[model samples]
Target chain A: SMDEECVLEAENKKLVEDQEKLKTELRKTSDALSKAQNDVMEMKMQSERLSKEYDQLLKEHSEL
Target chain B: SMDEECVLEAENKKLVEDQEKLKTELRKTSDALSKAQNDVMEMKMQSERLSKEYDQLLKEHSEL
Candidate 1:
């Protein structure tokens, strides 16, 4: 009975250890995703601002 | 011994299942990151093209 207790405890301990490791990996992945998402949004915003400038140029060009 | 065996097995099983769930989540997050990165690249490419057009407009404007 004591041997059983020791064995089960050891196995359970290993599982918990591995589980924690995976949790950390997930957290890192989520952080990277957030960073990537923000960069994409900023790129789009820059494109939009440049487009406005292009449109303004068209207006000026039409005058001549 | 049997009762301990059953209990330990159940606990171990749950941990494995949760670990699998985390792995799936990690995969999805990575895919999203890839998608976001691709969009950012496309947006930058578009900006580059528009910039060339803007430069051409400036050339015409300077003549006037």
Candidate 2:
């Protein structure tokens, strides 16, 4: 009886370790998500600023 | 024959589950790699935008 339970417990421990490794991988994914989000925001702002300048230039050219 | 086959199949199933776990881990790693790549591309674009703004400021300073 004891030996059987010991074997199962050992397998259980290994499964837990595998799950913990998955959790670590998830954490790394979350960090990457945050970085990607900030990068998107920064790029969007730059694009907006450039668009405004381009619009202004188009208006000037149209007047001429 | 059936019992012996069942036993072997159970063992085989356990091995498949373990391999599946590793595969899931690999998928997460691949996702992280893709995110990191996107972040790098975003950072490069942001840097280019900032440099353009810096050049604009330099031109304005020269005009003054």
Candidate 3:
């Protein structure tokens, strides 16, 4: 019975260790997701601004 | 020994469950990052295209 208890303790310890490691990775991933979302929003705005410039340039080009 | 084994089993089960939940969230975060990267690339291309058109238009105006 002692041996069985030891085995269970060892298994629990390993599972706890794995869970901590995954938690660390998940934190990093969450941070990355936030940054990526911010970057995507900036890019969307940039795309819109460039589209407007492209239209204006085409208009000027027609006049030229 | 049996009681200790039961406690260990419960703890391990809860940790495993939490880990699975985190794994699912990580997958979603990874997908969002991929989409954000794609958006940034598309925006970069668009900006380049507009700058080129703007330059061409200015050149034509100067020629006029």
Per residue, candidate 1 scores C-alpha lDDT tens digits across B4-53 of: 75875576567556655655665676677788767655655665576566
Which regions of candidate 3 fall more than 4 Å away from where they truly are? A1-64, B1-7
What's the CA error at residue B38 for candidate 1, in Å? 0.6
Q: What tens digits encode model 1's per-residue C-alpha lDDT throughout A5-48?
A: 78766865675566556556555665776787676666556655
Error of 3 at B33 (Å): 0.8
How would the candidate models be sorted by TM-score, starting from the highest?
A: 1, 3, 2
lDDT of 3 by residue, A1-64 (tens): 7988787668656755665565566556657767877765666566556656755664566432
Query: Model 1 scores what on Cα lDDT?
Result: 0.61
Error of 2 at B52 (Å): 53
Q: After superposition, how far is residue A60 of candidate 3 from its true place, in Å?
A: 75
TM-score of each candidate? 0.46, 0.42, 0.43
lDDT of 2 by residue, A1-64 (tens): 4867577558656755665565566567657777775766565566557656655764675421
lDDT of 2 at B57: 61
Residue B40 of model 3 has an lDDT of: 58
Between 2 and 3, whose TM-score is larger? 3
